[PDB]
Amino acid sequence: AQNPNCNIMIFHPTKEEFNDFDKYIAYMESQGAHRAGLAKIIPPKEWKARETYDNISEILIATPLQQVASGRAGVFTQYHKKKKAMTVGEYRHLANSKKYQTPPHQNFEDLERKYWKNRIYNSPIYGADISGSLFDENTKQWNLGHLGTIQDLLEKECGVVIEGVNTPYLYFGMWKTTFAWHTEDMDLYSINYLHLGEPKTWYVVPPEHGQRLERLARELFPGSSRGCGAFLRHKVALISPTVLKENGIPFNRITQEAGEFMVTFPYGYHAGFNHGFNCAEAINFATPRWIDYGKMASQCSCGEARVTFSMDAFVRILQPERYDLWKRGQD
Numbered sequence: 604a605q606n607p608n609c610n611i612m613i614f615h616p617t618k619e620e621f622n623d624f625d626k627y628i629a630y631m632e633s634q635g636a637h638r639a640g641l642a643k644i645i646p647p648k649e650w651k652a653r654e655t656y657d658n659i660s661e662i663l664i665a666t667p668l669q670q671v672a673s674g675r676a677g678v679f680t681q682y683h684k685k686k687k688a689m690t691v692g693e694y695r696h697l698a699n700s701k702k703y704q705t706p707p708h709q710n711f712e713d714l715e716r717k718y719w720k721n722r723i724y725n726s727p728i729y730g731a732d733i734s735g736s737l738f739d740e741n742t743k744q745w746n747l748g749h750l751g752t753i754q755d756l757l758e759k760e761c762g763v764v765i766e767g768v769n770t771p772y773l774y775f776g777m778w779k780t781t782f783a784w785h786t787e788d789m790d791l792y793s794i795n796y797l798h799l800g801e802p803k804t805w806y807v808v809p810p811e812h813g814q815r816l817e818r819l820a821r822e823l824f825p826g827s828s829r830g831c832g833a834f835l836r837h838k839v840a841l842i843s844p845t846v847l848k849e850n851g852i853p854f855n856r857i858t859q860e861a862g863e864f865m866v867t868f869p870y871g872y873h874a875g876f877n878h879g880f881n882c883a884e885a886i887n888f889a890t891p892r893w894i895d896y897g898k899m900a901s902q903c904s905c906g907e908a909r910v911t912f913s914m915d916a917f918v919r920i921l922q923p924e925r926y927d928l929w930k931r932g933q934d
């Protein structure tokens with residue numbers, strides 16, 4: 604079995620290997636990449652997402668989110684307080700202000716220490732889940748706005764035609780902006796490109812060990828656990844690497860830099876933080892290997908998780924028994 608220790612693998616495709624997305628994902632899996640839950644893909648040196656980032660300041664962040672923490676430094680939840688709209692130019696200024704800027708640090712490890720020590724004492728502002736793309740339409744390889752859709756994959760695999768579309772989202776981050784522990788909707792894959800700015804640190808649990816994370820989460824967030832049998836779908840809970848190590852949960856960490864892709868694999872729990880002002884783009888996708896994960900994905904039916912239009916068909920077709928109860932949570 605390839606990659607039995609579930610290490611995060613890093614790939615360096617040639618420009619020739621960068622032509623066929625599906626084939627390259629399947630190659631990575633042949634080498635065991637999926638076992639980690641997360642892989643890094645460094646694009647060929649000839650490749651570019653677009654010519655420059657000079658003209659992005661007028662993108663609107665219609666609902667910036669202030670991420671307010673509660674709990675203790677290594678075990679906390681965050682809630683998202685909606686703030687007034689601002690442009691990317693305004694947001695970049697805000698991220699760079701004395702109140703919100705990255706502190707002096709030695710290296711990524713020192714910054715990671717400072718994040719876990721101090722995150723809860725600040726409330727950074729995140730521009731998340733903004734429908735759109737920063738890939739030039741003329742970028743033909745690994746353009747996250749031109750991937751094959753999850754609906755077409757399900758049709759090709761299963762023969763059922765369904766409604767729904769599949770489009771990318773932009774994330775504008777600052778120091779301490781945080782993504783809570785989660786898997787993707789319907790345990791899909793995700794791909795994330797860091798277009799510009801400061802890094803993003805990721806933590807990931809191997810898919811084969813996801814239930815160990817869930818068990819710990821139920822212990823650490825006991826009221827949330829009683830409220831919902833899939834409360835990690837709410838995307839609000841954080842657990843530090845120190846805490847994971849204390850409880851014997853297998854995980855790995857890696858820092859993504861501007862110009863690099865990360866792929867998360869089905870049922871790979873992941874969490875992370877941004878080092879400073881940055882812009883990422885991400886999208887879910889599917890492969891044939893995903894189908895069985897989609898059929899087994901947990902679902903939130905308490906009403907908190909509230910997700911896209913397109914998830915309806917996935918639940919309806921892959922999880923008909925759950926559909927009724929899940930839909931009640933949706934409405």
Ligand SMILES: O=C(O)CNC(=O)C(=O)O
Pocket residue numbers: 774781782793794795803867883885886
């Ligand atoms: O970059 C972020 O804030 C969050 N991204 C993801 O969880 C992802 O790409 O799956």
Ligand SMILES: [Mg+2]
Pocket residue numbers: 658659660661662
């Ligand atoms: Mg603009």
Ligand code: NI
Pocket residue numbers: 785786787793867873
């Ligand atoms: Ni994700």
Ligand SMILES: [Zn+2]
Pocket residue numbers: 830831832833834836837903904905906907908
């Ligand atoms: Zn729920």
